[PDB]
Amino acid sequence: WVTFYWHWKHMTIWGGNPGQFDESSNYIMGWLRDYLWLNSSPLINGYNPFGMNNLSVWSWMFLFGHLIWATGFMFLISWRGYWQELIETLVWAHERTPLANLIRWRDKPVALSIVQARLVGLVHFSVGYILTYAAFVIASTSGKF
Amino acid sequence: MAASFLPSILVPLVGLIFPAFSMALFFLYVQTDDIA
């Protein structure tokens, strides 16, 4: 919220129209439409069916961050028992598969622990959050000005 | 020999050779049964 506020106020100042922030920041749709949607444009066109420019790395990082954040959702929402039961069938399959059962693990595969899954989900969430916003702020500011 | 050659020399060493050997070494260390 803090950085969104800073960035939108500065983007409207730098764009020569502070009045856009002054009027549209008073309701949420103003933030969604005039800050995020409007300023997504150069970022999402870093590459497209017609070519690419030097902002394509930020477009890719933007999608990368969305993906990492969503993958963190998996660890945060689904918990351990489901995964442990699934890994049990995986162990069964490997032990019973010819030419692959020539090779065996020396550390029994187990699902991630309860706390470990909370931490992994949190790390994925945080990395995705940071990378998405960094790509957006850099690409939007640099592709506009 | 020139320094301008260094990226194409060094980047494959940093990004392919070094991680592979580091991962192999860590794997061997974690599989070792008596480390001390």
Binding site: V91, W92, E95, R96, R104 | -
Partner: protein, 132 residues
């Protein structure tokens, strides 16, 4: 003395061969269908039955089910790969829920749970508060 069972993919794995295995025996007085803890139904034999399982918890789940059949003579053993056996349950011939003379209390602390010492008081000792 195996029950009538067509087999499943849920049975024991390499661990039963290399780490440890479990066996449960019991006496049934008739042929009756029961639920295998590993999935599926098996038919008990009239007389002695023997069943092999990967985990002690599986044996105890089966014994809990046997209790609903009025069967209380089940015995549970652990078998090691060398062939050594350990008699596990009921350890002294009496169910643990029934108090028995000759058992000694293990792991009691002679105070209520609120009297364990403070963590900061045993730092660097290697012990925990519940063990001191």
């Amino acid at each position: 003395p195996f029950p009538t069972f067509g087999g499943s993919t849920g049975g024991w794995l390499r661990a039963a061969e290399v780490e440890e295995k479990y066996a449960i025996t019991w006496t049934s007085t008739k042929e009756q269908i029961f639920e295998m803890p590993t999935g599926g139904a098996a038919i008990m034999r009239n007389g002695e039955n023997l069943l092999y399982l990967a985990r002690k918890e599986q044996c105890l789940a089966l014994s809990t089910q046997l209790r609903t059949f009025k069967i209380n003579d089940y015995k549970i053993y652990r078998i090691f790969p060398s062939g050594e056996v350990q008699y596990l349950h009921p350890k002294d011939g009496v169910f643990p829920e029934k108090v028995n003379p000759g058992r000694t209390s293990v792991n009691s602390r002679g105070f209520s749970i609120g009297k364990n010492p403070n963590p900061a008081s045993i730092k660097f000792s290697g012990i925990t508060t519940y063990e001191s």
